[PDB]
Amino acid sequence: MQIKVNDNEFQLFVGEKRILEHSKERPMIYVGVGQEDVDMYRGNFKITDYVTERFPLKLTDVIQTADTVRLCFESYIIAKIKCDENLCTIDFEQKDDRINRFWFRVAADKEEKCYGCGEQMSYFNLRGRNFPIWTSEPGVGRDKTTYVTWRSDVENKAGGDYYNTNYPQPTFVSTNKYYLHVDSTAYADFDFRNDSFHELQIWEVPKQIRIECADTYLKLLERITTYFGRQPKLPDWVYNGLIIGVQGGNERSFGLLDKTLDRNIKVAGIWCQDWCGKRVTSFGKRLQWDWKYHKEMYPDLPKKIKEINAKGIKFLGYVNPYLVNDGELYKEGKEKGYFATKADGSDYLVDFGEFYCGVVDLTNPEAFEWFKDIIKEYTLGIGIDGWMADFGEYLPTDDICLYSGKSPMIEHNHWPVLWAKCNYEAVKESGKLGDVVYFMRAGGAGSQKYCTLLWAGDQSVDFTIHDGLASVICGALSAGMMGCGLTHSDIGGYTSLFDNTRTKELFLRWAEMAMFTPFMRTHEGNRPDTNFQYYDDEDTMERLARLVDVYTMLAPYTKTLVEENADSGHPVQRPLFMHYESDAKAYDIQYEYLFGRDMLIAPVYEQDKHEWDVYLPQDEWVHLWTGEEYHGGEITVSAELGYTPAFYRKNSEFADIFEEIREKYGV
Amino acid sequence: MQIKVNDNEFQLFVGEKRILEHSKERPMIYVGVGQEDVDMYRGNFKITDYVTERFPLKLTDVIQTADTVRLCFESYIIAKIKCDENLCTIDFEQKDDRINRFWFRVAADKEEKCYGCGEQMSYFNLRGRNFPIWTSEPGVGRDKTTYVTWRSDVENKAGGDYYNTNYPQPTFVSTNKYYLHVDSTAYADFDFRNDSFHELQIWEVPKQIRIECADTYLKLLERITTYFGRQPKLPDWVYNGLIIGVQGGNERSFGLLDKTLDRNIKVAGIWCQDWCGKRVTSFGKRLQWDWKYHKEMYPDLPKKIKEINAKGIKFLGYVNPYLVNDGELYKEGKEKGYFATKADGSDYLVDFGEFYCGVVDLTNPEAFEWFKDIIKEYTLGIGIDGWMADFGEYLPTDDICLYSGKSPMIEHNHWPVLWAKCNYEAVKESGKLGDVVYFMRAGGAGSQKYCTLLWAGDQSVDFTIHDGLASVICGALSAGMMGCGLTHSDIGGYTSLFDNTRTKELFLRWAEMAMFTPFMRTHEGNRPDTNFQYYDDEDTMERLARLVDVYTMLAPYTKTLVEENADSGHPVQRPLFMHYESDAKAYDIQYEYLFGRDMLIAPVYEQDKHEWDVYLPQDEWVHLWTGEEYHGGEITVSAELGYTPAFYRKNSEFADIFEEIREKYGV
Ligand SMILES: O=S(=O)(O)C[C@H]1CNC[C@@H](O)[C@@H]1O
Ligand SMILES: O=S(=O)(O)C[C@H]1CNC[C@@H](O)[C@@H]1O
């Protein structure tokens, strides 16, 4: 990167491509004054802004030092710029206290594409749209043309839209082979609707903007994860097979484990989210938010965990950073003063849907340490080797006080990372990194270090584009470009509402994609009695045993991808353009991915399909199940139920593993 | 109205209430730069704006002469303020050509209420919401919680919202007893969401803002209509009875007339909107847009008109300012170059839903006179005595050129008044003002002069709040506060879509309201074959005979109201606070109206009702059907089908008429 600058024009280049400019004709910064309106309803946020001032700044002074270039903008902003061959930082100082709106422009051209802004569930390429950065419920349906979405809006204010996500991040990657990060947890809105610039709206003057370039996307990801962090290797035991999501107490849950094993489905672990109890609401069968094992539903659980461990099976649980008001840990947290409070001193109670919970104040070090100790003592301490570490999106912005003294308009997006750090430190302090794994749906900048595994959050139980099976693929790709290289999904989705229920076909198509991911896990969903469950159908269990076997057979390859993610930040699920940078079509494809360097996966995301159109970049490919060879381009392969459109490179060093799969399970 | 002004502060008072202020702490004007996006689909407009600059102006010079005060605002705006005891005008000169966004603030307090912004169908009191000023299709359903609205959005982009209207106007009335008008036909957005100020956003620097006060709302309406215009009296023949909306050609239409008369329903006129032919689309039974009578459907129509005239019955038709591209008049207009054109020089063909029409360029004086002559020759010239003068909302903004050379962003809202003027001059030059009547659903500033009669446009055929019977009352109250004092509605509504079809009860509830309006007219609606028609049911025809007879019995009173409207601008349908200005509840009521000074009407707007709650202001009231006396407050009256909740003042000079009605048709 190179800086060019006079007394009234600043420029920054990446190669021969200008990416920053401030002149009178093309200002780089606008500042202004806004008054927001934020209305939360059960984790959904309706956010509007009333802007009374917005104006571009005048560059009134420039000072060049061998290390720093200083831009003075009247009495509003000072920008200190420092550059290397690969890194520019722009630190901002605010000289006018009135400003609470900050618009930053990046030079662009019509053909450029951008990726990221966190885990995006609808659009991988961000160009042409804008993306608010505000963690929240991602929406049920997420598509205003569907009945599920409309009913979700009408009854629950919960239909959402294309940009909602549990894990937004003020960071993007450009096809000019740089990434840009705005060091701020404020509300932001990344606007890619203009041909000649990207505009980044921030609801504070951000501390710094960071820009870093590389010669390849692989190296760009190495630089991204150097700055944000890298995940550990997953525990070796995850590759033993399926992690089965079952509920109902000792007899039912361990009964289904035995039934699962008896049908020759390989099991890595049993995940009982109700290990701490159940709570039934009008949404469905939920959990008792009090993070100690439930002695009536799962008596003697520590002893029982030792027993299944001796048979090669791990036990997985569930925690989240809230506590319901009738729980034992709530009573203790109240007595110790560890909840976020209102101005009058009452503990703030959040409505999660017919029950009310305190928000453990993770910005209070004593409360943070207390909750970390709850994980150590009552989850890790009874031998639980993994858990869902849920939520993080529900911090309200109305009359709530945090120990940090910062506005909830700033701490709201910070919360997922504070929650991630709490889990990470519990595991690290216990010496269990690499032995236990928790998985999170919410995140922010820093989840690259503090989250051991993402999952895609709640999908609807359907084949829709914006909230079904397909949206998992988009979420994997976007998250991976942010440096979160390990993700998975609920096999079969989660959300059943408004006559939308899971089918056998949906479960199996979901499973045949999951076997080409690091972590296979099922989920009964919110209404288990009226949604298909794999253990309800012998044919499904037979079919599932094959899919899980394929996962275990892939594991020597998958371990090298997880290792490569841990070593350099190359995600396990990669976009096609990560290894085919010259292929123009690879930049527009978001429903196929490279499973490592050596496999291409194009999951079937529609019902009643028997063949599937696949775009293959130019290379020597072999269809997994048939061995037929392909050299690149649009094709159509058979894709019956159980036969994922999956291809491997001919000269892959793992071709023997893939051939063993074909011989055993091909056509 | 008194001005206070020094070098650093301007103020304007109405009595002892400050209505305008400019100081550095409370600026009166912001200016800026925006880039709109106007997405048009079949008369529906999705409009968004991208504001890049907005900033308050600094008052840098004040010049007082004897009559004028000149406020200079840097190099941006000069405002010339001239006041009287009742009138203040602010003329704006634009000194910076870059400005295309103008925000004008009006001082307000929390208890103030505001009325107007044209004909509003959802909210009469505007306080607490914002109202875009852009004529368009008003929406089907207009309520995001209903199935009809949702489907209208999904299939037709046509659900609309609370603010959409055929007739917006940048004019409001305040409870400080002033009205304010912005002299512009640009897009505007009147924002009443803030306690301490109204803010009027205009997408140009407006020529002038006009403010005029008065001691009473009656006198305010006198001033409003002195400025905007007053309607003529309605022709005496309208009071002869019902205007029946029928279709199908000579045999069916005049057959239905005979049937109606045979059932002893008094008929003032037969309104055949298909006088010029039909066109069937997926929307339903529409019309052929070629404004000459259809010689195959209505052979020898001029002869038929003479025959029914000799029996005391008028004939009414239909025109609108567009021409379908397979018609005779389209061919002539195309030859003479009388259509609006695109940038590429071709005639712009607007899609109205499976057919395409030219827009007669009403800004071209030659085309204007031509279309006026079309009305004289082919409507008035064959003896038609009234007509629906429809549409006016569909001018596109994307790629169109007008003879005026003004932007379609300015002429779009202008079109309804140009079209009104076309009809007005045809009638006036024919010497028929007061003898023939046309009715319009679209309008703008000036419709007060150029439109002889409003109607509330298309309602859905239901009892919903935002698009059924009740929204007619809101439209009547709001239009009347703007000086359009004559209005009516389709008895039974118009729009049938998405499993919503007209019922008998709905038709009858609508008719029993309509008999307390100036003009009773039915309509077959868009899907006559699958919707209730009054002539389907003998009991309905017997009931309608009574309702129409009541309308004729009221005529001596109603005529004095229409004459009062023509002489002073007091609307026929008045808000309760127009005659009870001290009644606090009168300012919150929008589904009751005073029918002149001597009657209160509170229509049943819900199904399955046998009684109705009514608020009466403090006065001596007599329930029309029973004779029971009431003295003010909340009451409940019997309100069976046919017994509108209607009350008259005991001391009314017309009490003898009202007693005859009770004797003949009461309980
Ligand atoms: O119902 S609960 O809220 O207790 C648990 C759910 C929370 N969201 C993620 C889902 O996977 C959990 O089952
Ligand atoms: O269907 S048509 O468009 O020809 C006529 C309708 C237009 N809008 C107003 C309605 O009253 C008409 O029937």
Query: Would you call B45 helix, strand, or coil by DSSP?
Result: strand
Q: Decide if B41 touches A, using CB distance below 8 A.
A: no
Asked if residues B505 and B227 have their Cβ atoms less than 8 Å apart, the reply is: no
Residues of B marked active site are found at 390, 393, 458
Answer yes or no: is the C-beta of B390 below 6 A from any ligand 2 atom: yes
Q: Decide if B56 touches A, using CB distance below 8 A.
A: yes
Mutate to test the interface with B, among A46, A53, A57 (most CBs of B within 10 A): A53
Asked if residues A95 and A127 have their Cβ atoms less than 8 Å apart, the reply is: no
- Residue B473 sits in the same domain as residue B420: yes
If you take atom 7 of ligand 2, which residue's CA is the nearest one? B390
Q: Decide if B343 touches A, using CB distance below 8 A.
A: no
Instruction: Kindly give the distance from the C-alpha atom of residue B41 to the centroid of ligand 2, in angstroms, as a whole number.
Output: 17
Collect all residues of chain A within an 8 Å Cβ-Cβ radius of residue B32: 54
Question: Which sign does the torsion angle of CA B139, B140, B142, B144 carry?
Answer: negative
Asked if residues A397 and A46 have their Cβ atoms less than 8 Å apart, the reply is: no
Reported in sequence order, the residue ranges of B183-306 that DSSP labels E, i.e. its strands, are 188-194, 197-202, 208-213, 242-245, 267-271, 278-280, 285-287
Element (H, E) at B68: strand B68-73
Q: What is the resolution of this structure in A?
A: 1.9
Collect all residues of chain B within an 8 Å Cβ-Cβ radius of residue A51: 51, 54
Nearest C-alpha neighbor of B320 from the set B418, B415, B389, B371? B389
Instruction: Kindly give the distance from the C-alpha atom of residue B526 to the centroid of ligand 2, in angstroms, as a whole number.
Output: 7
Asked if residues B310 and B361 have their Cβ atoms less than 8 Å apart, the reply is: no
How do A267-271 and A314-319 pair as beta strands?
parallel
Element (H, E) at B509: helix B504-514
- Residue B550 sits in the same domain as residue B666: no
- Interchain contact, A53 vs B51, CB within 8 Å: no
Nearest ligand, measured from the Cα of A458? 1
Instruction: Kindly give the distance from the C-alpha atom of residue A286 to the centroid of ligand 1, in angstroms, as a whole number.
Output: 6
Answer yes or no: is the C-beta of B92 below 6 A from any ligand 2 atom: no
- Residue B346 sits in the same domain as residue B410: yes
Asked if residues A647 and A548 have their Cβ atoms less than 8 Å apart, the reply is: no
Angle between helices A301-310 and A250-262 (to 10 degrees): 10
Nearest ligand, measured from the Cα of A521? 1
- Interchain contact, B32 vs A51, CB within 8 Å: no
Distance CA B29, CA B200 (A): 10
Asked if residues B46 and B157 have their Cβ atoms less than 8 Å apart, the reply is: yes
Question: How many CB atoms neighbour CB B432 within 10 A?
Answer: 15
| Residue of chain A minimizing CA distance to B150 | A150
Distance CA B371, CA B423 (A): 9
Residues of A marked active site are found at 390, 393, 458
Q: Decide if A32 touches B, using CB distance below 8 A.
A: yes
- Residue A553 sits in the same domain as residue A613: no
Ligand 2 atom, smallest distance to B388 CA: 11
* Last residue of one domain, picked from the residues A547, A572, A597: A572
Q: Which phi-psi region, left, alpha or beta, contains residue B107 (left: φ > 0; alpha: ψ -120 to 50)?
A: beta
Q: Which of residues 170-209 of B touch A (CB under 8 A)?
A: none
Render A486-502 in DSSP notation, one character per residue. ----EET-SB--TT---
Alpha-carbon gap: B67 to the closest alpha carbon of chain A (Å)? 33
Q: What is the largest CA-CA distance in chain B?
A: 77
DSSP B58: P
End-to-end C-alpha distance for chain A, whole angstroms: 53
* Last residue of one domain, picked from the residues B185, B214, B243: B214
Question: How many CB atoms neighbour CB B356 within 10 A?
Answer: 16
How do B314-319 and B267-271 pair as beta strands?
parallel
For residue A74, give both structure tokens.
Answer: 């009247």
Distance CA B388, CA B375 (A): 12
Alpha-carbon gap: A52 to the closest alpha carbon of chain B (Å)? 7
Answer yes or no: is the C-beta of B286 below 6 A from any ligand 2 atom: yes
Reported in sequence order, the residue ranges of B161-277 that DSSP labels E, i.e. its strands, are 168-174, 178-182, 188-194, 197-202, 208-213, 242-245, 267-271
C-alpha dist (Å) from residue A159 to A458, B48, B146 = 13, 22, 15
Strand partners, B159: none
Backbone angles phi, psi at B369, to 5 degrees: -60, -40
Asked if residues B476 and B565 have their Cβ atoms less than 8 Å apart, the reply is: no
Instruction: Kindly give the distance from the C-alpha atom of residue B463 to the centroid of ligand 1, in angstroms, as a whole number.
Output: 41
- Residue A443 sits in the same domain as residue A465: yes
- Residue B265 sits in the same domain as residue B142: no
Facing residue for B54 by CB, picked from A54, A145, A150: A54
Strand partners, A244: A270
Q: Decide if A162 touches B, using CB distance below 8 A.
A: no
- Residue A104 sits in the same domain as residue A233: no
Question: Which sign does the torsion angle of CA A38, A41, A44, A46 carry?
Answer: negative
* Last residue of one domain, picked from the residues B170, B195, B214: B214
Ligand 1 atom, smallest distance to A457 CA: 9
- Residue A168 sits in the same domain as residue A244: no
Q: Decide if A398 touches B, using CB distance below 8 A.
A: no
Residues in chain B: 667
Question: Which sign does the torsion angle of CA B373, B377, B381, B382 carry?
Answer: negative
Cα B307–B309–B312 angle (5° rounding)? 125
Q: Decide if A137 touches B, using CB distance below 8 A.
A: no
Strand partners, B71: B62, B79
- Residue B284 sits in the same domain as residue B364: yes
Cα B499–B505–B507 angle (5° rounding)? 85
| Residue of chain A minimizing CA distance to B149 | A150
**Cβ contacts of residue A589 below 8 Å, gap of 6+?**
A575, A576, A615
Distance CA B414, CA B187 (A): 10
Distance CA B114, CA A294 (A): 59
Between chain A and chain B, how many beta carbons pairs sit less than 8 Å apart? Answer: 30
Residue type, B89: T
**Cβ contacts of residue A537 below 8 Å, gap of 6+?**
A504
| Residue of chain A minimizing CA distance to B191 | A50
Query: Would you call A618 helix, strand, or coil by DSSP?
Result: coil
Answer yes or no: is the C-beta of B247 below 6 A from any ligand 2 atom: no
How do A490-491 and A521-522 pair as beta strands?
parallel
C-alpha dist (Å) from residue B453 to B281, B479, B485, B518 = 29, 11, 8, 9
Question: Which sign does the torsion angle of CA A321, A324, A328, A332 carry?
Answer: positive
Instruction: Kindly give the distance from the C-alpha atom of residue B139 to the centroid of ligand 2, in angstroms, as a whole number.
Output: 14
C-alpha dist (Å) from residue A141 to A127, A165, A189 = 22, 12, 22
Render A93-114 in DSSP notation, one character per residue. EE--TT--EEEEEEE--TT--E
Strand partners, B341: B347, B401
**Cβ contacts of residue A97 below 8 Å, gap of 6+?**
none
Nearest C-alpha neighbor of A642 from the set A439, A505, A481? A505
Distance CA B440, CA B456 (A): 9
Distance CA B621, CA B658 (A): 12
- Interchain contact, B30 vs A52, CB within 8 Å: yes
Ligand 2 atom, smallest distance to B490 CA: 11
Mutate to test the interface with B, among A48, A49, A52 (most CBs of B within 10 A): A52
**Cβ contacts of residue B489 below 8 Å, gap of 6+?**
B455, B456, B459, B472, B475, B510, B514, B517
Distance CA B584, CA B590 (A): 13
For residue B162, give both structure tokens.
Answer: 């609370």
Render A266-295 in DSSP notation, one character per residue. -EEEEE-GGGG-EEE-SS-EEE----S--T
- Residue B194 sits in the same domain as residue B105: yes
Asked if residues A206 and A103 have their Cβ atoms less than 8 Å apart, the reply is: no
Answer yes or no: is the C-beta of B521 below 6 A from any ligand 2 atom: no
Render A433-445 in DSSP notation, one character per residue. BTTBEEEBS---T
- Residue B23 sits in the same domain as residue B119: yes
HSE value, Cβ hemisphere, 13 Å, CA-based, for A234 = 28
Cα B5–B8–B12 angle (5° rounding)? 30
Strand partners, B134: none
Nearest ligand, measured from the Cα of A317? 1
Question: How many CB atoms neighbour CB B67 within 10 A?
Answer: 10
The three state secondary structure string of A167-199 is CEEEEEEECCCEEEEECCCCCEEEECCCCCEEE
| Residue of chain B minimizing CA distance to A148 | B150
Distance CA B264, CA B528 (A): 23
Nearest ligand, measured from the Cα of B278? 2
Query: Would you call B353 helix, strand, or coil by DSSP?
Result: coil
Distance CA B16, CA B19 (A): 9
Nearest C-alpha neighbor of A208 from the set A18, A75, A79? A79
Q: Decide if B145 touches A, using CB distance below 8 A.
A: yes
Q: Supply the range of the domain harboring residue B598.
A: 573-667
| Residue of chain A minimizing CA distance to B147 | A150
Asked if residues A211 and A179 have their Cβ atoms less than 8 Å apart, the reply is: yes
If you take atom 1 of ligand 2, which residue's CA is the nearest one? B286
- Look at chain A and report how many structural domains it folds into: 3
**Cβ contacts of residue A573 below 8 Å, gap of 6+?**
A473, A476, A477, A480, A485, A487, A517, A593, A594, A595
User: Which residue carries 């509007």 as its tokens?
Assistant: A48
Mutate to test the interface with A, among B33, B50, B54, B129 (most CBs of A within 10 A): B54
Nearest C-alpha neighbor of B30 from the set B131, B93, B105? B105
Cα B62–B64–B70 angle (5° rounding)? 50
Alpha-carbon gap: A145 to the closest alpha carbon of chain B (Å)? 6
Tell me the technique behind this structure. X-ray
Question: How many CB atoms neighbour CB B362 within 10 A?
Answer: 26
Collect all residues of chain B within an 8 Å Cβ-Cβ radius of residue A144: 153-154
| Residue of chain A minimizing CA distance to B102 | A52
Torsion of CA B444, B446, B452, B456, to 10 degrees: 20
Collect all residues of chain B within an 8 Å Cβ-Cβ radius of residue A52: 30, 54, 56
Strand partners, A269: A243, A314
For residue A210, give both structure tokens.
Answer: 């960071």
| Residue of chain B minimizing CA distance to A104 | B52
**Cβ contacts of residue A574 below 8 Å, gap of 6+?**
A477, A480, A593, A594, A595, A596, A597
Instruction: Kindly give the distance from the C-alpha atom of residue B603 to the centroid of ligand 2, in angstroms, as a whole number.
Output: 26
DSSP B305: H
Q: B593: domain CATH number? A: 2.60.40.1180
- Interchain contact, B54 vs A56, CB within 8 Å: no
Alpha-carbon gap: B153 to the closest alpha carbon of chain A (Å)? 8
C-alpha dist (Å) from residue B222 to B228, B232, B434, B569, B576 = 10, 15, 21, 5, 17
Distance CA B483, CA B149 (A): 31
**Cβ contacts of residue A162 below 8 Å, gap of 6+?**
A121, A122, A123, A129, A142, A466
Distance CA B191, CA B189 (A): 6
- Residue B199 sits in the same domain as residue B310: no
Facing residue for A53 by CB, picked from B54, B150, B154: B54
